[PDB]
Design an enzyme around this catalytic site. Sequence first.
Site, PDB file in Angstrom:
ATOM      1  CD  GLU A 131      -3.137   0.370   0.359  1.00 62.66           C
ATOM      2  OE1 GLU A 131      -2.168   1.623  -0.974  1.00 62.66           O
ATOM      3  OE2 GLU A 131      -4.078  -0.073  -0.094  1.00 62.66           O
ATOM      4  NE  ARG A 169      -7.838  -1.339   1.770  1.00 63.85           N
ATOM      5  CZ  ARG A 169      -7.442  -0.536   2.618  1.00 63.85           C
ATOM      6  NH1 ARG A 169      -6.911   0.190   2.675  1.00 63.85           N
ATOM      7  NH2 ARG A 169      -8.274  -1.261   3.923  1.00 63.85           N
TER       8      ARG A 169
HETATM    9  N1  LIG Z   1      -6.007   1.974   1.112  1.00 59.79           N
HETATM   10  C1  LIG Z   1      -6.671   3.358   1.878  1.00 59.79           C
HETATM   11  N2  LIG Z   1      -6.536   3.709   2.308  1.00 59.79           N
HETATM   12  C2  LIG Z   1      -6.961   5.263   2.629  1.00 59.79           C
HETATM   13  C3  LIG Z   1      -7.626   5.918   1.370  1.00 59.79           C
HETATM   14  N3  LIG Z   1      -8.660   7.120   1.611  1.00 59.79           N
HETATM   15  C4  LIG Z   1      -8.590   6.461   2.993  1.00 59.79           C
HETATM   16  N4  LIG Z   1      -7.347   5.565   3.066  1.00 59.79           N
HETATM   17  C5  LIG Z   1      -7.115   5.238   4.675  1.00 59.79           C
HETATM   18  O1  LIG Z   1      -7.790   4.831   5.371  1.00 59.79           O
HETATM   19  C6  LIG Z   1      -9.219   5.510   6.345  1.00 59.79           C
HETATM   20  C7  LIG Z   1     -10.195   5.477   5.729  1.00 59.79           C
HETATM   21  O2  LIG Z   1     -10.922   4.362   5.976  1.00 59.79           O
HETATM   22  C8  LIG Z   1      -7.226   4.929   0.352  1.00 59.79           C
HETATM   23  O3  LIG Z   1      -8.387   5.467  -1.023  1.00 59.79           O
HETATM   24  N5  LIG Z   1      -6.769   3.575  -0.150  1.00 59.79           N
END
Ligand SMILES: Nc1nc2c(ncn2COCCO)c(=O)[nH]1
Lengths: 226, 230
Positions: B34, B99
Amino acid sequence: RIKKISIEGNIAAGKSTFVNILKQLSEDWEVVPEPVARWSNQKNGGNVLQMMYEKPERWSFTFQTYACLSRIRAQLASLNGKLKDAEKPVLFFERSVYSDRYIFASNLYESESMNETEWTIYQDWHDWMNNQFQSLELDGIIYLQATPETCLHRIYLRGRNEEQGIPLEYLEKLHYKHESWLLHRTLKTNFDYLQEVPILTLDVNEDFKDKYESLVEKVKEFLSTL
Amino acid sequence: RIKKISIEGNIAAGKSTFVNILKQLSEDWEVVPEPVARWSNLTMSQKNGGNVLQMMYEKPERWSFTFQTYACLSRIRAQLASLNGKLKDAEKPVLFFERSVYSDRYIFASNLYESESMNETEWTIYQDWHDWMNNQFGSLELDGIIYLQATPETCLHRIYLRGRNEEQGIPLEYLEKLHYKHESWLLHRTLKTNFDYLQEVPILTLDVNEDFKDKYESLVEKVKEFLSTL
Ligand SMILES: Nc1nc2c(ncn2COCCO)c(=O)[nH]1
Ligand SMILES: O=c1ccn([C@@H]2O[C@H](COP(=O)(O)OP(=O)(O)O)[C@@H](O)[C@H]2O)c(=O)[nH]1
Ligand SMILES: O=c1ccn([C@@H]2O[C@H](COP(=O)(O)OP(=O)(O)O)[C@@H](O)[C@H]2O)c(=O)[nH]1
Ligand SMILES: Nc1nc2c(ncn2COCCO)c(=O)[nH]1
């Protein structure tokens, strides 16, 4: 194959006027209109512009991003379809993603309407956009050079309110940014090919709409040098 | 030739644990973590992510659009570089993405739009920015999806377990919303997207409620079972 020439110039310098006239003179001559103009008076484009007017420190990133994406989308559609066909096709870019960044986005950072993080992220994506969505390279630039006073007059000689004639110092700043970029070739860019690209400068201070042959003569031989 | 498989799941499901287990097993398997997990803890990317991460936690209705657009670009770049810039080579090459562009859009962004952290104009702009780009660039379409399913309570327990602060957890209620969105996409398959190979992409669902750090063999077996059907 299709020749690509962006028209540059400060606000109200006469680009639309010049580009509309240029497109009427040849079926080989096609244009891509600027997305910003006409967003005034699709829905997303009306909204951002109004908020950007109302509060540049909130929406400049959002606006500058969507504008450059709108320009790229537009410039691809008339490239991957429009005119050619044509024998000696030339496609006139009404402004460009270089003036999107190095003039307008840049000014907004400089009047602190984007913070440092907005402006680095913008500058990063800019590369990534230009590199992924490549064959947009200009062969020439035509700069419509005018004094800030002429443009101040011409904004008034148009339709002020809603857009309004802003500060003259705001026009001087964009002027000196245009001059430093196109007249003097001092602005340093990430797109190396720009230093090796021909520029036609055109003193557009005198009125031209019913008397433009001299300007088109200059454009036709500038075209021949390419 | 490369198989592209997404690892999806609620926050603190153990996606990052699971992918780090799979990368140690096979020469043909690689991981793309990520970009957004490296913004919690010198590369302007991290400087920018670091900064937009906190600002977002500090003011989501100001920053949702900017964060979301930046995260998605960074992920798109990381998927493009890992892909045509790796080992092939390989006999049966598999790339796990931690993801995807799709959780970004239909989990996070959509959740932020439903919560008024983005207005209509922003959400609409985001969507045609996302629509346009994952059609222009994206090779990154997926051969499969793995669904690591936990309860929000396991997730909150695991948020606590992880590290917290600047990453944090708080609401059990928010985790519940996200948990519900993943079901509709990945388990009932009622969430209809703007991508129509996705209504039909094979989906593996792994119950990860019970700790799998010392007991992961049966989960990895299913993954293997799943890959050789793709
Ligand atoms: N992996 C991911 N984490 C996110 C994103 N936006 C915010 N976050 C952090 O997580 C908190 C929101 O669920 C996103 O688009 N992708
Ligand atoms: O030689 C010219 C060029 C422009 N204009 C006027 O100046 C205004 C702004 O010009 P334009 O829209 O073409 O400027 P742009 O922003 O597109 O450069 C318009 O009302 C034009 O009619 C003019 O009177 N004479
Ligand atoms: O079987 C497991 C899987 C997860 N974790 C812990 O749960 C926390 C959150 O996991 P992770 O960051 O990998 O979740 P993700 O966000 O990646 O889904 C981490 O501290 C892990 O060490 C654990 O204790 N046992
Ligand atoms: N052409 C162009 N104009 C902009 C931009 N941002 C704000 N404006 C203002 O446009 C009105 C004057 O041309 C931009 O990125 N490009």
